[PDB]
Design an enzyme around this catalytic site. Structure first.
Site, short mmCIF file in Angstrom:
data_model
loop_
_atom_site.label_atom_id
_atom_site.label_comp_id
_atom_site.label_asym_id
_atom_site.label_seq_id
_atom_site.Cartn_x
_atom_site.Cartn_y
_atom_site.Cartn_z
N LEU A 144 -4.30 5.35 -8.86
CA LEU A 144 -4.40 3.92 -8.98
C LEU A 144 -2.94 3.45 -8.89
O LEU A 144 -2.28 3.36 -9.87
CB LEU A 144 -5.10 3.57 -10.31
CG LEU A 144 -6.53 4.03 -10.52
CD1 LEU A 144 -6.62 5.28 -11.31
CD2 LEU A 144 -7.34 2.96 -11.28
N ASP A 145 -2.45 3.18 -7.67
CA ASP A 145 -1.03 3.12 -7.41
C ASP A 145 -0.42 2.01 -8.20
O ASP A 145 0.69 2.19 -8.74
CB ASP A 145 -0.76 2.92 -5.96
CG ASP A 145 -0.96 4.18 -5.18
OD1 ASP A 145 -0.41 5.21 -5.61
OD2 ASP A 145 -1.70 4.14 -4.20
N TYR B 51 2.45 7.50 1.52
CA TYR B 51 1.95 6.32 2.20
C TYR B 51 2.86 5.10 2.04
O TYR B 51 3.66 5.03 1.13
CB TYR B 51 0.53 5.96 1.79
CG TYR B 51 -0.58 6.58 2.62
CD1 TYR B 51 -1.71 7.17 1.87
CD2 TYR B 51 -0.60 6.61 4.03
CE1 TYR B 51 -2.74 7.76 2.60
CE2 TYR B 51 -1.60 7.21 4.75
CZ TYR B 51 -2.72 7.79 3.99
OH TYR B 51 -3.72 8.32 4.66
N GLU C 1 -0.52 2.97 -11.94
CA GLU C 1 0.06 4.26 -12.29
C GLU C 1 1.52 4.44 -11.85
O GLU C 1 2.23 5.29 -12.40
CB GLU C 1 -0.86 5.39 -11.80
CG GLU C 1 -2.25 5.42 -12.48
CD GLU C 1 -3.03 6.67 -12.15
OE1 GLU C 1 -3.23 7.00 -10.96
OE2 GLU C 1 -3.45 7.37 -13.07
N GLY D 3 3.16 1.35 -9.81
CA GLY D 3 3.61 -0.03 -9.77
C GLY D 3 4.11 -0.50 -8.40
O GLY D 3 5.03 0.09 -7.83
N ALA D 4 3.45 -1.53 -7.84
CA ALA D 4 3.80 -2.01 -6.54
C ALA D 4 5.23 -2.59 -6.54
O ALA D 4 5.85 -2.69 -5.51
CB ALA D 4 2.81 -3.04 -6.04
N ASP E 194 -13.51 -21.69 -17.22
CA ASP E 194 -12.36 -20.93 -16.76
C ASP E 194 -12.80 -19.49 -16.44
O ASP E 194 -13.25 -18.76 -17.30
CB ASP E 194 -11.31 -20.91 -17.84
CG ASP E 194 -10.82 -22.36 -18.20
OD1 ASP E 194 -10.73 -23.25 -17.33
OD2 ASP E 194 -10.44 -22.55 -19.32
N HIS F 61 -9.25 3.66 0.50
CA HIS F 61 -8.20 2.87 -0.13
C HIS F 61 -8.89 1.58 -0.55
O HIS F 61 -9.24 0.76 0.29
CB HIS F 61 -7.08 2.46 0.80
CG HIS F 61 -6.40 3.57 1.55
ND1 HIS F 61 -5.22 4.14 1.14
CD2 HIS F 61 -6.72 4.18 2.72
CE1 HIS F 61 -4.84 5.05 2.02
NE2 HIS F 61 -5.73 5.07 2.99
N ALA G 20 4.32 4.73 -1.73
CA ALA G 20 3.70 5.53 -2.72
C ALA G 20 3.74 6.95 -2.20
O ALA G 20 2.82 7.44 -1.57
CB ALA G 20 2.31 5.04 -2.95
CU LIG Z 1 -5.89 6.51 4.39
#
Ligand SMILES: [Cu+2]
Ligand SMILES: [Cu+2]
Lengths: 657, 657
Positions: free
Chosen positions: B303-304, B390, B307, B309-310, B598, B443, B387
């Site tokens: 879970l990029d 990738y 786990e 961080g973008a 909300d 993905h 990541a």
């Molecule tokens: Cu792929």
């Protein structure tokens, strides 16, 4: 005597060849009064063409297909002219069909209805005085199909509108009635008048030119800073006549009255091994079925390609406005009713554009100093055609990974019908402006692919993602994550009749089962990745479903035969949809073999349009796309010999520091 | 004393604020040995922010969220620092979770395995001598989840590869075993060794730099003619700090360690009436589940976002290579383990690009001399993160019709595992190079939308195209063409749990049921048009399904509460997926109301990847997209006051001739 043969056997007919063909046909029918509906290339048989191209075989004869009318005779005659000998070599009479509506067939209808006493009367009852008829306009459609007349007369239906001023967009002001017009006699023969009358709108027109917008919102936005695109050293692509070369692709760009752009003889040069991909690809038919059940709106399901022609409707594109950058243009040539060639200038534009990144990777180990970035370029071959109210923008896109994409942008204007002050438009349409009902509709397209993936002998397959059938906790799928691609190879036509399935993210392979990728062990393929695949909403047995039998499935695969181009038949207008022709003929009893042979793959895609006020009075471009991509065709990424935009290796980064 | 307050309450923490926060926390835990895992903005409560922005309300306090480790203590501690008073105001100990893996947490693992006697031994048994360990590399992943250890130690699994030369792409040469590494002790604690050993490949590395390609195919292609893009008069967009204005849109561009780009406070200026659209939009989580069932490959479902961080993984983008044109860059600021601010330069790039035609229509009546064409410009806000193997390219795109699009391009390198000479890769992967098995995987992404379509009080709905239920031949559907859009408004959370359906071309509306479009009578909405929506292939109850409960449906709608950001929980690594947290908490028993309130709308989209050799050794960009588009928001096309590129009215064309 004979016209000069073209550079290439797929080249469209030149203006000289058109005139030679119509002179030939006029002479064959000397003493008869005839008019020309179509004069176009009869493309060579596939076998003849390939043999010519790759086997030193016979030069295919240069042939023109013609459709004519004869005054006082029902239907049409069609045939073939051999241009080298200036003679008609095949001919026949089809008394019970009606052909494509040409610009000239349509142009006179507006003046016919303006001068017809019964129409005038309806305009007056609708609140327009008899002496303001110059303000009444119509979009002339085929009747499409009306069971009161069949194909026994050639008919149009006029969708009538009003303009307060000649510069208005008329579509805010439709009228409630529908004249039916005999195309050959130039007379109104009937008017469909609704039980509930709605008189012309009193509102202001809903307009979109700068002068209108200034009145409506006060001012235009300021001209934006420019964004200028130049190619100071020229383009990477090369055209030789109609033959394109770019980024290892080679193909022929053809064009005709009906399909518009036709791409043929498509290959890719894989480091000196020139590998065929497709013999032909084009859009072969369309249908745009409206979703109001009320009479006469069932007659709104235009098959624009077969009924008007994507070439015939195609716009002259101009530099800057339609296509910016450095452009190569092609012209289109047709026949008019008298047999004289007509030219649409700049009907096709060809250019290359930046297309962001082709690929990138960096190594985190030296904080991305080890890095490679390569930018992508795409090649675009496009036209834009106008089907009365709507504009279809068509973009055939070649990419440096070897994929080919069709992109379409829909713009223009909603088809509108009148709405009374107290009338609810839903559930069949949307009130997008006061007194304006924009009916629901689909836009569907039949992409025709004649493949030769790495040569002849091809097959097709549905590919469905599936979870392992072994359960969670089994030795075979202990944690329940296993998944695979389930491939269903189509053996007979019937197997192929398939739809897009979200449940399995279905894609379709077109492949060569006689070959094998040396790495993966799979056959070389091009994969159709396409998810804009609406179900046909019209019911089985409906007029729409019968006239467009291809539209009922996302994929239809049939054996190749010569002249299997147009899947709703050769002469579309006024066909009831009863009978064995087009796709229904090619499908047959579903039993013929389509595994490892010459096949044709027709894909139905498009969109379902619920209009909203954002769409009016002029609609923002709406996008449609599909892609055909190489999978197991190459043995590695085929763009890696493109110079990177930036590249630094690990050794190089260490030296820098 | 205190740091300067930022220009805007959503501005990320400056470097001064990060250091003030870590000094505050160090002082609060004086005499303890601690390290910093995360120091980031705690964004203001939604109510506090809106009230501040639009109601002259209280200035929200400037707060930093922190996660720390203490040596010899299990798990983490987290809390909040009030920056104006330099004090810790909330704090707690979470002994049974593990936090996001930072660059420093990962950087030492390669040297740990290179020096571990048991790993050396496996390298030797795999055919690599003990004194060539400098040639052994690994990509350090979270363990993800392993039931032998839970969260009781902080663990990584090393995916091990070999390089013949430092400039090789290592992914052609994976090894067969998997060391498990204690992150805090820096020691290998276990090695998963397969029952069937496969020794290192003898083949050449599969390489992609120019020097490699010259060796491999003989030569690079020539440098292509350039395509140059300039904006000699500058850009139409305006940034004030982090606040963007462009084409009537206004919004705040934020950034954090985890989500990367966060767009907030998005409005559109509709001729002076500034109308909110979204409060916040971002990617909130990801999962990339592999589809081989064989041990230990179940542990491949990163879970990029949660786990790694973008933001933490984000590349410094540079001018020309990553983003060409005239660019405005933003930097990103984080804390390192010692509490010192780190800066990623040029983490976000912002520019505008030509985007073809916005709209066009011409009148066939004067052969298209009556014509209007307006070209479109798009605004792009992007980052690219790595990541390990990738690369994810993220493009937030604003359009002049008022739509907003997320486009993603996937590139980089396939995750690979070793394949024996006689081993079949299928059905779980593809042999993309000799001895290289690239396993199947999905993905998947969770787009988090906090809407306020035209203000507060919103709802959501599925919209399905349906044929009339009246049959062909009935008075209500005589010709069987009738169709409509069936709207299912979600009343409780449970209703919202929906997937994309090809059968109905499902889209989803987010709307304001307290308002009404004056033309159409419908509520103002933004419509999610998204068809790249794979089913989760992993089974119910699987590790993947439990750790990513959001991924099981395309759409999950829940009530807003503060701090409902991360749908697999706040501390993702090593969570078994058992327990009421994240989305599973927010869903609850499914009964809470989500109509006119909300809400938060989490959309699961992405792709399912069956690798092929075209993907190797470096993958051509693969595209993913979704769009949020105004429907019944405006009363007409909102771009008509943009100056056309070409415009000629009917009156004007008549005068020309
Ligand atoms: Cu792929
Ligand atoms: Cu439409």
């Amino acid at each position: 005597a004979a016209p000069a043969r073209p550079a290439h056997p797929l080249d469209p007919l030149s203006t000289a060849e058109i005139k030679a063909a119509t002179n030939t046909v006029k002479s064959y029918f000397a003493g008869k009064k005839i008019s020309f509906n179509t004069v176009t290339l009869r493309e060579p048989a596939r076998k003849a063409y390939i043999q010519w191209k790759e086997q030193g075989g016979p030069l295919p004869p240069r042939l023109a297909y013609y459709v004519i009318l004869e005054a006082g005779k029902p239907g049409v005659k069609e045939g073939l002219v051999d241009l080298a000998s200036l003679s008609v070599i095949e001919t026949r009479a089809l008394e019970t069909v009606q052909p494509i509506l040409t610009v000239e067939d349509l142009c006179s209808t507006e003046e016919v209805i303006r001068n017809d006493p019964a129409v005038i009367e309806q305009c007056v009852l609708s609140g327009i005085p008899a002496n303001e008829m110059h303000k009444v306009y119509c979009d002339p459609w085929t009747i499409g199909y009306d069971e009161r007349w069949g194909t026994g007369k050639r008919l149009q239906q006029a969708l009538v509108y009003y303009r307060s001023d000649e510069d208005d967009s008329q579509y805010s002001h439709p009228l409630d009635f529908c004249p039916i017009v005999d195309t050959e006699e130039k007379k109104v023969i009937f008017i469909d008048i609704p039980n509930r009358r709605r008189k012309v709108s009193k509102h202001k027109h809903a307009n979109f030119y700068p002068k209108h917008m200034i009145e409506k919102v006060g001012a235009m936005r300021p001209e934006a800073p420019p964004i200028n695109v130049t190619q100071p050293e020229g383009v990477s692509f090369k055209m030789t006549g109609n033959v394109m070369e770019w980024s290892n692709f080679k193909f022929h760009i053809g064009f005709n009255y009906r399909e518009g752009i036709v791409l043929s003889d498509v290959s890719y040069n894989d480091h000196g091994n020139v590998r065929p991909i497709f013999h032909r690809i084009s859009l072969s038919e369309m249908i745009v079925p409206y979703g109001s059940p009320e009479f006469p709106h069932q007659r709104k399901h235009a098959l624009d390609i077969g009924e008007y022609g994507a070439g015939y409707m195609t716009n002259p594109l101009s530099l800057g406005c339609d296509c910016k950058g450095v452009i190569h243009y092609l012209d289109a040539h047709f026949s008019d009713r008298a047999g004289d060639p007509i030219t649409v200038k700049n009907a096709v534009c060809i250019h290359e554009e930046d297309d962001g990144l082709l690929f990138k990777h960096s190594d985190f180990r030296d904080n991305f100093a080890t890095s490679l970035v390569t930018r992508a370029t795409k090649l675009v071959v496009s036209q834009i055609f106008t089907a009365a109210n709507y504009e279809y923008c068509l973009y055939w896109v070649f990419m440096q990974d070897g994929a080919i994409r069709l992109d379409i942008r829909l713009t223009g204007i909603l088809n509108t019908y009148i709405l009374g002050d107290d009338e609810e438009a839903g559930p069949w349409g949307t009130r997008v402006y006061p007194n304006v009902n924009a009916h629901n509709h689909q836009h569907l397209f039949s992409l025709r692919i004649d493949p030769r993936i790495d040569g002849d002998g091809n097959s097709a397959a549905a590919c469905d993602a599936k979870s392992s059938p072994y359960p969670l906790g089994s030795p075979e799928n202990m944690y329940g994550n296993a998944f695979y691609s389930e491939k269903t190879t189509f053996k007979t036509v019937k197997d192929s009749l398939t739809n897009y399935e979200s449940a399995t993210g279905r894609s379709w392979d077109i492949f060569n089962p006689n070959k094998v990728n040396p790495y993966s062990g799979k056959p070389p393929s091009y994969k159709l990745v396409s998810t804009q695949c609406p179900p046909l909403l019209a019911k089985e047995g409906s007029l729409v479903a019968k006239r467009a039998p291809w539209a009922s499935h996302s994929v239809n695969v049939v054996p190749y035969k010569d002249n299997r181009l147009y899947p709703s038949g050769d002469h579309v207008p006024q066909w009831s949809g009863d009978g064995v022709r087009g796709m229904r003929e090619w499908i047959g009893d579903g039993s013929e073999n389509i595994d490892n042979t010459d096949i044709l793959f027709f894909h139905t895609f498009g969109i379902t349009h619920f209009p909203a006020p954002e769409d009016f009075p002029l609609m923002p471009a709406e996008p449609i796309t599909l892609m055909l991509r190489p999978r197991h065709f190459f043995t590695e990424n085929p763009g890696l010999d493109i110079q990177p935009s930036y590249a630094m290796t690990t050794s190089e980064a260490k030296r820098a520091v």
